[PDB]
Design a protein around this ligand. Sequence first.
Ligand code: SF4
Ligand code: SF4
Ligand code: FCO
Ligand code: FCO
Ligand code: SF3
Ligand code: SF3
Ligand code: F3S
Ligand code: F3S
Ligand code: CL
Ligand code: CL
Ligand code: CL
Ligand code: CL
Ligand code: MG
Ligand code: MG
Ligand code: NI
Ligand code: NI
Lengths: 263, 263, 581, 581
Amino acid sequence: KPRIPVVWIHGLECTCCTESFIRSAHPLAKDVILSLISLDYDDTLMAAAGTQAEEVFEDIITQYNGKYILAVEGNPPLGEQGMFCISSGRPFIEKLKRAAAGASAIIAWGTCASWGCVQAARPNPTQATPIDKVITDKPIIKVPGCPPIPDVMSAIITYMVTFDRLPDVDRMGRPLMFYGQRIHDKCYRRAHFDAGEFVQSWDDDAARKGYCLYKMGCKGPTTYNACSSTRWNDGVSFPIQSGHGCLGCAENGFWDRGSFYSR
Amino acid sequence: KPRIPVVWIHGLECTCCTESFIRSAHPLAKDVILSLISLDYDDTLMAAAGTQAEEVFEDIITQYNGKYILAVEGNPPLGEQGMFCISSGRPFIEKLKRAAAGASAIIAWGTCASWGCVQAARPNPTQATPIDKVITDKPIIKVPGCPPIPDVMSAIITYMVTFDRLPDVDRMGRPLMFYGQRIHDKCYRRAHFDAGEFVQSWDDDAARKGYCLYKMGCKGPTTYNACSSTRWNDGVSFPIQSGHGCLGCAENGFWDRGSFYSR
Amino acid sequence: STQYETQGYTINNAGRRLVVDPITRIEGHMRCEVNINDQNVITNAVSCGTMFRGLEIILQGRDPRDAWAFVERICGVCTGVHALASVYAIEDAIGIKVPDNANIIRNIMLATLWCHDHLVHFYQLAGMDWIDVLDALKADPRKTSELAQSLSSWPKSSPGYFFDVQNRLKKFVEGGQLGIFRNGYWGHPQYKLPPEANLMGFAHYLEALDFQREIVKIHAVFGGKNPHPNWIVGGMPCAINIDESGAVGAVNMERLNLVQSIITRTADFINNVMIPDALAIGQFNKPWSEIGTGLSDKCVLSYGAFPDIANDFGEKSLLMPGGAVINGDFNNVLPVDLVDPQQVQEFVDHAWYRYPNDQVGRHPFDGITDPWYNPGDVKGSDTNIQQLNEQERYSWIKAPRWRGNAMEVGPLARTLIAYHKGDAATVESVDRMMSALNLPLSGIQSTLGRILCRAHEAQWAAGKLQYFFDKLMTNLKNGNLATASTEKWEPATWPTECRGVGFTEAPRGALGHWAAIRDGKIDLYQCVVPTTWNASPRDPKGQIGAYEAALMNTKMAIPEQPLEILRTLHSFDPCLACSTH
Amino acid sequence: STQYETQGYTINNAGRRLVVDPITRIEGHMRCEVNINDQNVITNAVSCGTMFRGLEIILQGRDPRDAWAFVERICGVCTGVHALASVYAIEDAIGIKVPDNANIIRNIMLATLWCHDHLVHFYQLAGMDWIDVLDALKADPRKTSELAQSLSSWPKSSPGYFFDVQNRLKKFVEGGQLGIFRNGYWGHPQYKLPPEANLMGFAHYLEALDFQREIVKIHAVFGGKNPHPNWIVGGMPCAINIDESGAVGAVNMERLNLVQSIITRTADFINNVMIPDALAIGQFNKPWSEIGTGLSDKCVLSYGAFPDIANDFGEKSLLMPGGAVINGDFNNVLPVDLVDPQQVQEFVDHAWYRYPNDQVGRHPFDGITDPWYNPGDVKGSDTNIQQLNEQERYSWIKAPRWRGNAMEVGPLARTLIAYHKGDAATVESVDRMMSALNLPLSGIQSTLGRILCRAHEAQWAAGKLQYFFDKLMTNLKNGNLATASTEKWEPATWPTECRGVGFTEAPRGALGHWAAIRDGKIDLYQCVVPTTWNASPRDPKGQIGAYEAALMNTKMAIPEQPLEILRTLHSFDPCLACSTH
Ligand code: SF4
Ligand code: SF4
Ligand code: FCO
Ligand code: FCO
Ligand code: SF3
Ligand code: SF3
Ligand code: F3S
Ligand code: F3S
Ligand SMILES: [Cl-]
Ligand SMILES: [Cl-]
Ligand SMILES: [Cl-]
Ligand SMILES: [Cl-]
Ligand SMILES: [Mg+2]
Ligand SMILES: [Mg+2]
Ligand code: NI
Ligand code: NI
């Protein structure tokens, strides 16, 4: 029985979101690709290149017009008439608009597609712009984080396939299931925060006991994600567990909310 | 290069401690037995039975006198002249005493060997007694829990092998590394406890959001273990994460500290 | 020395007495004694449980809601099954109906346990009775690869792999520290595998030791931890949230995805490693289809298990059939009623307990657990037993009977009940299996048969795991999330006096918990557990239980080395902590 | 049209033009154009980076302690390497020395990255250029098993396994949704593996896709997460506690045990799956040992990496040698100095940037990143390019040179440098590898050689992983726990003006970050990254970079199908986000 078509496109990016996706522990990314979805276009993984690849792109968006999911990694630059990101000799933004037009829905992977991420940090040399400021007529599910958690990415896909619907979202379009609560509201170091038990300098006795990282700049109190519950890399760790405060990487504009080591 | 000899004996028990050990994810129990220690006696796993098994027991404790680790699961009953637990026709406590006398050090696995566990709960029909009240002239490392965490059991073994010493202990003989802090002091639901956000009845809205289980009788505030940090079964879960309050199962006398659902 | 007749057997304590204490590669503490005649054949068999803790005493005065946590600790091998029976018993007493998802998750917990327990038993407990591990050092790696590839699609079959396994075993032995292999029965003539099958078996022992840790991750997700997961009266505490804020704090899509991944791997391991291994042990040890019959052709018992309709414990709901056969009459599968005082009764005339009249059996609602260590005229002394006196009291295990009959419980019993009730899956499994071995149907009623039926049950349970998971997901697709009923959580809602039975089929057989509640507290808590049945001592008529019967009439090649005794006992998968509680 | 000579090549843009835009199975955005003569031979090659973000601009005015986190996001494939180079640079500027354990853990992070990145490149990026995935459907499973077992001890080799893999593929394509395999080059005459080797390679593609996720668990332990772990100026934030209260909150024995388990599995997979597959591709594609040489027999560059003596970046410390070869004189491995203004320079006369004088090169401490999108006289328009004009500006990639020379960087370059410095382990690996293929040593200077060297290096890194881990454990045994230096954490302790260089060997080659700090803020931050070197456009003398040179003189079987172009480009493992930053 056929699998749901997914077109995965790439703007200005570091490819962290693709890399996170293939980390998925359950379902394995292998099984997502072979059994759960039909990953019909993706420059990073596909056999075809050049004219062969673009024939696939055009065939898929035509034949499955109105019936495919568009996944977007990275973002479009508006500067230099869009040619800070060139795709088949033309601005990326034009490929984005074409792909968006045929999609039933769009997944904005990562802080890049959701908000802007690092290229949009001051002074945004390329005028990198999040998808929802370019595409204003389609459902967009924001899955932020730099990158998002692997098993979050795959759980959102399994939800779509199993329940035949988009995840319900918050006011910013993030799936409630994984972005409804703050890092700090599910943090295992919260007892220390509450007691005033803080790391004050790296590798002090507090650090060696897993005390709270608030005074080292942790942005968990203002950041919504599943890192402190679902955790990373098959439940192995998350930023705070390994001794670094949250950077705030799931939140809009986190790069320019001051030093990671300041309040 | 010869591996440290370990003699593992079993008193009154349910065998949860042996079962926990073989769950070890890293090192695999397989690798502990083939590469790290010499598991020279263990009734639950050994090929030999009866006279053949006791020939092994006697020879090991003779040949390696002063140089083996004694691991103890379960505990000795003092009732009925010790014959609530019979070992080769004799009271278990006699076997415990003979094994203890040649050991370099003893590991008291689980709440049974550490404290007494379920058979010692009121009214303790058999007069089940923890190891340290019977063997009083040997190093005893208490590793409590019902059972202890698999990867904590194997971590303690690796510490002994790699460092050639016993873990440092608290005033009750528990390894500081895993028992120095409370469940509640590293609990990911602590934010909810601090906010007065509590499950009030099973499967309420609060429960469906992972709120704190204190009002449902969670004993995390008085229990020292690694469950909320290290977690269970290769970092998959722990009691609180799966929605049940801590029972207090690493603590002396926990069965008789009132209903698990009461304060 | 005396002789008497019971159940077709001549019990005769003339001749050499052999003692095996401890029985190893079981849970907990057992001693076994036999007498052998001049042809080295067993003419007397004595089953002794050598431990007691007293959970039935400890449970008095506890809150019924707490009971599951105490009785779970009856056993860490069959971890969970006593919690399940407890919440069933308490719910039955009070009149609690749980939500469908709670029932489905409970079934998943039980099926997970069946898979895990049966796998570990096959390899780590019984395996070395059949696999000569030390003989694997003589195997050809290529011939081992060829054998494995002839039996299974399992991927891990390369010559190099078997060489690596063999080489590891070699270097392990070279160390002069044989560990769990020291002073085994290696080379005994009853070891029939060729070296290649021993190397294949040993490699699988190691692979199973590793893989078993994964199966219980299902218990960790729904139950917090394994061993000894958590449960509640009223359902399960693992609240579900798929699509709402805070799903990170509950059973969510990522958690369910983990569970699905474990199910698939678990089926794959059982179907492609354990099942071919069990068939191969069959093929090389066909004479053991005629040894250890015991009560399996006379009297077998199942209560049934896995209610597929939530809160319905009837015949149309239980996926695992219940029923009783007596007198070798497999054409009349009788119904079991756990409240009927004339059905299940326990005797203690040959056990270390006090009753007002030890010549009568007590139904568990009239049960008494008053320990009395009195071994009588042993050879030796009270604290140094050289020979138990089986004419008097000789065990910490009570003697259960069903309508006065001594019964066998467990996988073989269940298979026979299901087969004779005409369950289609079971008939076909059993027919095809015995066909593959070119043995008559009667060969299943044996020590070999016990092992084969247990393997097949692991396959069955792995299949049901998926079925139950899919039923959970179907409920979730329909917006049915409930995991607990709390209508009667509060003691004020309960009857002032009520009693209940919780029953299931644990990995080893028919399990029941009988609970009486009075004034908000446990007034009485009596357990009758599968190994209580199988390892039972004698009764006032001198009738022997399943172990003693299965050992009767058995040839030993080398009296000093109890390989044949171990084989038969291990085939029942003894759980001694269970048996005594 | 125009013709000129450079570096022994005749650059001729007469004749038919071919465009490949996008290059797929790379990180990021690349366009390639060539001209081919009548004989289907490439006579001109044009490398164009088709993306830019401007990290060098974004970093100005930032706190130096934050820099690592920004620059880490240059790339999520080579994740971590820019963070390492950043902390090195800031430490070099300020004068900070990290404790040994921090250096060891950094080395573990780098080796982990090498293992993971190389593995994924081989299978997921380059693999389908060598493995005909559809041809795998024609294989015989038994013959596939026999092939795999002839090459490796790897366990997963049964005929049933290969049948199951083949059947998954069959089912996948049966619906007509070929996904990532759609419109591939399958059946192209340059695919030379037999069906059995294709099925073996495809199975391994799938196994590698699964396994790679495990390797990065090391990054998760020490660095919180992967992609994009965390770091600090002054060492690492992953405080260690082995034997004190609160070890549950730190890197403890259980955490270290997890790491060890991953190391062993990683070495096993690389040595038993990837290494034999790399040799098998070599055995069936020997002509590719003479294709794509490019600059690899002329000019190669390594900065060196893995300082084994903490805070010592000299030749006695770096476990991966540094040095430069020019003019094909592999007897003169020249020392590299990243501060010398006459060594590393970047040119932009053929790139989309502004310099005061575009005919000279600028050392990175004098670097300028002033974007200027000016493709000049293209075929087409600024926003619809049919053909770039390689006589003018044609890339977002700057053109690095070393003493004016165009250099190749990456696994092959490093292997050559270490070989010619007399590194025993490298000499033996190379000699044995080329012996196994019956090829001359010169055969490593090639598209095939780049792939073989990369696979080699994954084995080397897996070995070093264990070495570093053992060093860490040795320190812990000695009570040496420190992971951070913090006496210069505060900006007021820093020089008012200072500058530093942080350098390493990323998976793709030589990486440098040049940082100037002034008044507690980043004043300048210039990156020169391995794919900047390899994918470089031309310079004022018209000298071509490594990709252009490697593509020169290449035969194409079918002009419209860029299989040969992809093979050579993929062999360098292009990272375009890296190249442009
Ligand atoms: S470490 Fe960060 S998220 Fe955790 S309690 Fe402290 S401030 Fe909150
Ligand atoms: S769930 Fe238990 S341990 Fe966690 S915060 Fe609440 S009371 Fe404390
Ligand atoms: N299976 C099992 Fe344990 C026994 N006997 C119980 O119930
Ligand atoms: N490897 C790698 Fe990325 C590139 N090019 C960096 O540095
Ligand atoms: Fe995830 S491509 Fe990497 S930068 Fe932050 S999300 Fe973007
Ligand atoms: Fe762990 S054998 Fe099981 S009861 Fe509590 S520890 Fe004891
Ligand atoms: S930095 Fe990002 S990965 Fe999670 S812990 Fe903070 S949202
Ligand atoms: S019940 Fe026991 S397992 Fe841990 S969470 Fe509490 S100490
Ligand atoms: Cl794209
Ligand atoms: Cl942003
Ligand atoms: Cl013992
Ligand atoms: Cl206790
Ligand atoms: Mg009982
Ligand atoms: Mg640069
Ligand atoms: Ni049991
Ligand atoms: Ni990169």
